[PDB]
Design an enzyme around this catalytic site. Structure first.
Site, short mmCIF file in Angstrom:
data_model
loop_
_atom_site.label_atom_id
_atom_site.label_comp_id
_atom_site.label_asym_id
_atom_site.label_seq_id
_atom_site.Cartn_x
_atom_site.Cartn_y
_atom_site.Cartn_z
N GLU A 53 -6.10 8.72 -70.55
CA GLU A 53 -5.45 8.04 -69.43
C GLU A 53 -3.99 8.42 -69.38
O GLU A 53 -3.52 9.00 -68.40
CB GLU A 53 -5.72 6.55 -69.56
N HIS A 109 -11.61 -0.14 -77.35
CA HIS A 109 -12.55 0.64 -76.54
C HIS A 109 -11.94 2.02 -76.32
O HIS A 109 -10.81 2.28 -76.72
CB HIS A 109 -12.81 -0.06 -75.19
N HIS A 135 -11.69 5.69 -73.59
CA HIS A 135 -11.86 6.43 -72.33
C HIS A 135 -12.07 7.88 -72.70
O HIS A 135 -11.40 8.36 -73.62
CB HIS A 135 -10.62 6.27 -71.42
N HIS A 176 -7.93 2.55 -77.08
CA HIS A 176 -7.07 1.42 -76.77
C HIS A 176 -7.45 0.24 -77.64
O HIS A 176 -8.57 -0.25 -77.59
CB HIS A 176 -7.24 1.02 -75.30
N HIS A 194 -18.42 0.05 -68.13
CA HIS A 194 -17.25 0.94 -67.90
C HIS A 194 -16.79 1.67 -69.14
O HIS A 194 -16.13 2.68 -69.01
CB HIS A 194 -16.02 0.26 -67.22
N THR A 207 -5.38 -0.74 -67.34
CA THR A 207 -5.80 0.45 -66.60
C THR A 207 -7.15 0.27 -65.90
O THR A 207 -7.63 1.20 -65.25
CB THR A 207 -5.87 1.68 -67.49
N1 LIG Z 1 -7.83 -0.12 -70.56
S1 LIG Z 1 -6.86 -1.25 -71.00
O1 LIG Z 1 -6.69 -1.23 -72.45
O2 LIG Z 1 -5.64 -1.26 -70.21
C1 LIG Z 1 -7.70 -2.77 -70.60
C2 LIG Z 1 -7.13 -3.99 -71.22
C3 LIG Z 1 -7.93 -5.12 -70.56
C4 LIG Z 1 -8.56 -6.04 -71.52
C5 LIG Z 1 -9.09 -7.30 -70.88
B1 LIG Z 1 -10.12 -8.16 -71.85
B2 LIG Z 1 -11.30 -8.87 -70.74
B3 LIG Z 1 -10.84 -8.25 -69.14
C6 LIG Z 1 -9.39 -7.35 -69.24
B4 LIG Z 1 -9.21 -8.91 -68.68
B5 LIG Z 1 -10.38 -9.90 -69.63
B6 LIG Z 1 -9.92 -9.84 -71.36
B7 LIG Z 1 -8.64 -9.85 -70.09
B8 LIG Z 1 -8.47 -8.76 -71.46
B9 LIG Z 1 -8.02 -8.24 -69.79
ZN LIG Z 2 -8.43 1.13 -71.95
#
Ligand SMILES: [N]S(=O)(=O)[C][C][C][C]C123[B@]45[B@]67[B@@]89[C@@]1%10B81%11B698B746B814B562B%10%1143
Ligand SMILES: [Zn+2]
Length: 257
Positions: free
Chosen positions: A103, A91, A93, A116, A61, A195
């Site tokens: 975003e 990461h 987007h 992000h 992704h 997101t």
């Molecule tokens: N685009 S954003 O920055 O909103 C995504 C943030 C999610 C980060 C994560 B990392 B892996 B999957 C998801 B679950 B697990 B760990 B937990 B943390 B959240």
């Molecule tokens: Zn993100």
């Protein structure tokens, strides 16, 4: 299963993740004239001098750089936050062309990309526990526009050819994320969500007002990535952004006048 295409993209996510239609979803449009200057907001404290990067990964992704989060080495504090948040990963987007990819939007403006930096609250002990809490994560969002090259991004750009397809990873040690930050730490903040699935409502968003500039050659390398795995039909990893979601009962606060 989920993705960004016609048949598995953002308009479908609510079927597996019903919180997609929740009260505090992200991203949002930031209406700059409606955001309230809050003089009680503190300067953001970004302490990345001891950051320890580990790996770079194509997760199907986006691509991410992951860090050692087993001690307070790269932490975010202050700003709107109570307590200490550890950097886990960053990461991006991005779009198929320079007029989309972010975003968050600013007065409906879309930037070419968005960075992000994902942090979790040390009071919950691990990220999997933190994502179950309304104040579990803090994500620092930084807009990218196309112009001059960002020197601190080049080390990332130069290894993307080694992680073209999904699940591929490489060593990525000694990367300094200070090199991705703009001059100013002026920000907007609001309560929101991840997101991407699972779309958990656990994030304090901190979105910097000042974008960074990256070159067209740098963003072109992002767009050579593939969503697909090795040997599968090639689908360029582009337009991996969720559009703006309803603000509902939330206030966006500005750290600056
Ligand atoms: N685009 S954003 O920055 O909103 C995504 C943030 C999610 C980060 C994560 B990392 B892996 B999957 C998801 B679950 B697990 B760990 B937990 B943390 B959240
Ligand atoms: Zn993100």
């Amino acid at each position: 299963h989920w993705g960004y295409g016609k048949h598995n993209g953002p308009e479908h996510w609510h079927k597996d993740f019903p919180i997609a239609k929740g009260e505090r979803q992200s991203p949002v449009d930031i209406d700059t004239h409606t955001a309230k200057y809050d003089p009680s907001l503190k300067p953001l404290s970004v302490s990345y001098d001891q950051a320890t990067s580990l790996r770079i990964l194509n997760n199907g992704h986006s691509f991410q750089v992951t860090f050692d989060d087993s001690q307070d080495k790269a932490v975010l504090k202050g700003g709107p936050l109570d307590g200490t948040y550890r950097l886990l990963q960053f990461h991006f987007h991005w779009g198929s062309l320079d007029g989309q990819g972010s975003e968050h939007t600013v007065d409906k403006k879309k930037y070419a990309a968005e960075l992000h930096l994902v942090h979790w609250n040390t009071k919950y002990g691990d990220v999997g526990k933190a994502v179950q809490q309304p104040d579990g994560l803090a994500v620092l969002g930084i807009f990218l526009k196309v112009g001059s090259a960002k020197p601190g991004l080049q080390k990332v750009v130069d290894v993307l050819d080694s992680i073209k397809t999904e699940g591929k990873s490489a060593d990525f040690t000694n990367f300094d994320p200070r090199g991705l930050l703009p001059e100013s730490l002026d920000y907007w903040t609001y309560p929101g969500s991840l997101t991407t699935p699972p779309l958990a409502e656990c994030v304090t968003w901190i979105v910097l007002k000042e974008p960074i500039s990256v070159s067209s050659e740098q963003v072109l390398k992002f767009r050579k990535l593939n969503f697909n795995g090795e040997g599968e039909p090639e689908e360029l990893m582009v337009d991996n952004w969720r559009p703006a979601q309803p603000l509902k009962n939330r206030q966006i606060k500005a750290s600056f006048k």
